[model samples]
Target: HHTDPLPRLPVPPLQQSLDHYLKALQPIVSEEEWAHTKQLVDEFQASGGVGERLQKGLERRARKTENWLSEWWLKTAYLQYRQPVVIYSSPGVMLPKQDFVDLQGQLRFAAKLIEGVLDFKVMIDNETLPVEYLGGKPLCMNQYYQILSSCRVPGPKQDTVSNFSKTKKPPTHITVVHNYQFFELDVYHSDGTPLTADQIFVQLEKIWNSSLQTNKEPVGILTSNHRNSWAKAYNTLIKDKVNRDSVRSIQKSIFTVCLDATMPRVSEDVYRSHVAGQMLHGGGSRLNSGNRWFDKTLQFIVAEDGSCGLVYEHAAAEGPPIVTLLDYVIEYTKKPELVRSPMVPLPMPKKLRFNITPEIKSDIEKAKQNLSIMIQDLDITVMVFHHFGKDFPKSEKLSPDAFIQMALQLAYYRIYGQACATYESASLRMFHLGRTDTIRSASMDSLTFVKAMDDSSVTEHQKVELLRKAVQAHRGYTDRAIRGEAFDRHLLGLKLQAIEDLVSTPDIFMDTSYAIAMHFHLSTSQVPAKTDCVMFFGPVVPDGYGVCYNPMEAHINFSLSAYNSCAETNAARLAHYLEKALLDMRALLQS
Candidate 1:
């Protein structure tokens, strides 16, 4: 809540102002720079992301990015977009500075849009809490634990520390507040090597520090000294390493966050009374003759098509010893009698249909090829934008206001391209490939303003206005997309595409979890199709604009790794089951 700026801490490398930033983008006359400029324009007209739009501009400025300045240019494009500002001008075109500011604002808006897309939440103890929602709440560790315990499957009969499987019970009526989510990601050293927790944190700290240094505006939880010092330190530590793999591997995957939906309490007394009654001992479990108790059973139906049947039931068999040590408890109800609620069931998930007719395979292969090209295009665009600022003279040569002006311009150029590239790729997928009609269509609608500007009838000012509206639309969809909102649509399209050409019948939609089950790749499951799930994406500002603590981002770091691990474990089990299924299939084929 403190508004006064923090004291300036001493930092090495010296602070560089807007002048330095402008200098960073100088000498825009290189061949590579000029090429990027062209590429950006081409992509923009085609409805691309900022990376594409900006790359085109930079390429136009410099024909080629040479040895001395290539890598720096590349990384900056991705990182600088973290901070943002606004700049706009008359329609036909904007001044360089205005364009930069406008684009920066767009990127920020896009990041915020992503947040909306990933609107994640969870239900615990019969209450649902959105990870994104926050209010007059105190943030503490135990409160989070209590909420998560209730949210877990097979939750405790009561929402208390002991019910949550803690050895000691917490005192009566301890009202507590807690941050909405905690983000935790575990990247590994390349080659499957492990880094100590301290080492990992240190590296992360350095990254945070460096990122802060470069992106001074749109500041968040992280605090840093002089603006550029962190960047210099980061380079000293991380830049020298040739092998990205050698430094760190994504040891784990995916972001995991716990959310609390405001649910009222049943009391600690009821829970303890249950324990006293010994209805179920520690966390409600009984043991058996062979040290094996039937703690719980999952009853599910399987269709011949490999889909889940409607009935998915869980029952506790508490006679003998299965697992008495429960890590946490799940609350059932306030009625004491209705303690472990009815069976929670889900429809069968979609599975991959391997019915590859030659034609189908050809189509899928073609789509995959296109995806690869998009990735490459994205990569190149980013590379070009990274160097957009290098052509300008060093900040030492410019005054403060002038420096800030140039930096803003450079930043905008970089970000506009990024937004344009993202838009273009998704658009191409929809309009041309018809891979995902929903997202593609949504993408087009979102970019209507941009498109109108490209049209002859639209004035540039009209176009700018339209672009702003388009930015809003794109943000909304992108946010939903990140939150797994469009997962269903994406999946339907994939399945339809698969069925259109495959030789064999496909399983229901959830079976696509098979990808996780099989280990080809893993990330958050989207609503429609499966794309890489990024829990903590940009708008990296901890509390951008006015957000206090974005719980979705906070919890996602943890959620990501947890989900990936779950996927890996599930994959192993799936492989075993599939092998058995394959045997049955083989027999059928023989018959």
Candidate 2:
């Protein structure tokens, strides 16, 4: 604890983390079936049994690598994931929409966005990115290091992410996609300085001119398939040398700019939903879905109708780093323009060429079919709560995040009359190269409070006291979770540790309660940003909901996602219940 460069992720006390595991499951599981779980836990972590052996192994691993959880978590959480990188896995951000009057205005903003990102790149490249600290502890800055110039490559079994943070030859070019045609636009002059906004706009116009044939192939959509299927298609698609070269160039580019035709304008009520879908996956393959390379780390999407935002391949980094870059760009866009120097000679952006054979052609068709169906099944609802936000919770001396989490629990109880497995992501960024640890938001205190909340016999004051304790309980839980005092990752480490030892899988891992905790009925995130934006992802399980909220000072912006395949869950109805849930909670506290 005294003096190291950066403290490695610690192995928690075996007794503490293991005991909390049972505590977390106590309320969610049956009371009659508790003894078996107890017996299993007793043996697994006895004085010098399986868990002791695993702890020694993990500690050794902690010293060996920068972080013991980084590699395994990446493999388990993202890389080994076989699903397509769509709404299901990756996240989309909706920036405050821009209102460009015409196509010329659209390209101008895109050029400015390109230059702004290039400016962020310069900070990252020079190691001049600000060191972010949380409560005096410096955060892991590595996530900022890897996000740009990165691409996730599909493989036969597991995928791999390529980042050129310290490559032999750095990338100076970016790929622009228009009507599904990708063009390699050089954003840097030969002198190694970034091009001015005017210079970039000139090349963007050339890129726009070359790709008028909307009837041509939409090769980028090939990425939006099941990973294994995409891998198989990739093997076939890379058969020729030219095709290989084209794929390599696209992957190596620093980032992507998608110049897309805007979806038809709609009423104000449905406009946010339409833009959210566009940023997520281009509103399916028929409209603008094909105009994306989903594996790219960052794609700045500019539509002719002035809808603009970004969709990132989530494996590269989390939302905070993305939002940090976004805050900079949003502020950058507002600054007055600088005077331009003399005109410089520029070349037409290279239209990345590919010769799609019959087999590859068939692969694109399959991708479109799969993507079209995928989007149709996804249901999203957005709400901007104008009445109150974080300040309301703060005035009650409550944690805003924990407050919303409790509201979510209450909302679910209102809908289903029962508690469930809830997931709120806890950042483990305090440790070197940290990823995430689980935050189970559905607490026993919450369950007790919700039960009393619906009981007619319970008085207002009595119910209000229960509500206070429940919020405080969750508030404390969030603190321990952020402090790395939670049991979720320890349990994961133990289970994964068992597998690494080549030992028989433990029965505790196979128990019914374990399965109950694994399926998150509600997956949620609270990403606070000053720039006024919202981050969203799809539900982890089909029958569940993904709820993300950004609690601004005066109002909160929420985006709820539910798969239409699951008839039991409705995103819009839950939003309705959640609004009421927040209001009632406030009323209880005030009374």
Candidate 3:
């Protein structure tokens, strides 16, 4: 449409730092796949003129080929994790209640889609694309916003792989929810051609059908036989720009990203908690009210535990818990909550004592049967996401949604230890920076403390001392179940024995978070707090690093809210417990 002599459209250089590393990996890939990919890219350059059929065809083919190659790359990354995971975080709880509800609404829409009830229901994590990447407005943040955004927004527009501009919104924040972006991913055959939408649908339906067939929900994963489909989808999602402004940061756009393009995947262990939470928080009652039985069942079960477990206790003016445990059971587990004791982490199965009556054995069998069905549903769902990712065109790929789908499935792999190395490589930030003296401090002022940490070129030891002070205060505030220790009122004292160690010598707390924060602030002594926030703090998602109260630690205190409750109280108390946990976290941080 821009007929003014093409306006000197500058072709972007393909000079990526990742290319050198990719070249190092060239030999490992099959020559055929590589050649196949280059052929498509060549086609795009030669015949795929701005809006011509050949250009479209060539781009599609190239994307298909590239997607094929990317699959191999993802596999390599997986190998890196040996067991992969995805991490996501939210600052939404720091916002107001209505904002939280609005955010949850987005997540609820996604739940419907996953359960196969709502068509065209919005994906999670899409709201922010207009703001962060597209220059839209701003609002509050929390877990609800985080998960909602996760399924949609991966990063900036350049990161997207699919092309559904019809669905994309003009930049705005408050009314932004009305227009959501979507990807039109394609499926391809192994020989490097395109696949039909029907073909993709069939594969997905097959997964659902097969899962339902076995008296199970089957998690809807189909990775084993449908990888070609994922590649095809990725390749098919090639976008052809027309009558538009080109985004300069192509990587930030919606094309090249996969797991790495967006926020990292919360290791499956962390995702499980959210998944469990979503499952417990069922969609509202149906018009016919046939599901009322399901609702009552969850409420009775969740209320008993007093912990959110699978069903979150929604605070509707503090009324009787409107969101019951039964809803989570129906949405997540797809079965009734077993009328049993509160959920307890399993010890080595052999170590448990149980009465072996026939009835008890039958109950156990039923439990196993239900669990098996849940696993099947999750597996089948992951397969569907993988298949979709494989099919989308890379030239126009929607990395945000693709990554969300990919991470969702990858979560299962991480939980099971079957994920590849890329899982960890993508998920771990490795560097973070924090404050030095909230309650604990050496003689340095805040400005000097931050400046000292920022200068990472110094000896590594000096760098670490800075990180400890930045993050030490906030680390104590997670749930006890999450933290792995029982709460002690003594922690309220800023003068706890643990704080004495760090206060006397601040260098010890300056571990990675502080170091990384400083590294990001290179050349500038004034450490930026916002960027530093993510770097030092990590996301709200539990890292499951040994820093958390694992089952062994859970046994020690016998209180599930151990670390979490400690964090929720006064900041001084939090500092005390973190000081203690830091002592324990020492070895794990090094690893």
Give the count of colliding residue pairs in each prediction.
Answer: 136, 0, 127
Whole-model lDDT, model 3: 0.21
Q: lDDT tens digits, residues 56-93, model 1?
A: 43333233322112223222322232221000000000
Q: Between 1 and 3, whose lDDT is larger?
A: 1
- Report each candidate's C-alpha RMSD, comma-separated, in the order given: 30.4, 1.9, 24.6
Error of 2 at 1 (Å): 22
* Local distance difference test, candidate 1: 0.21
The window of 10 residues in a row where model 1 has the poorest summed lDDT is: 86-95
Tens-digit lDDT track for model 3 on 248-338?
1111121110000011244653332322222321111111011111101111111101111221111100101112111232354333323
Residue 416 lDDT, candidate 2, scale 0-100: 89
TM-score of 3: 0.21
True lDDT of residue 273, candidate 3: 30
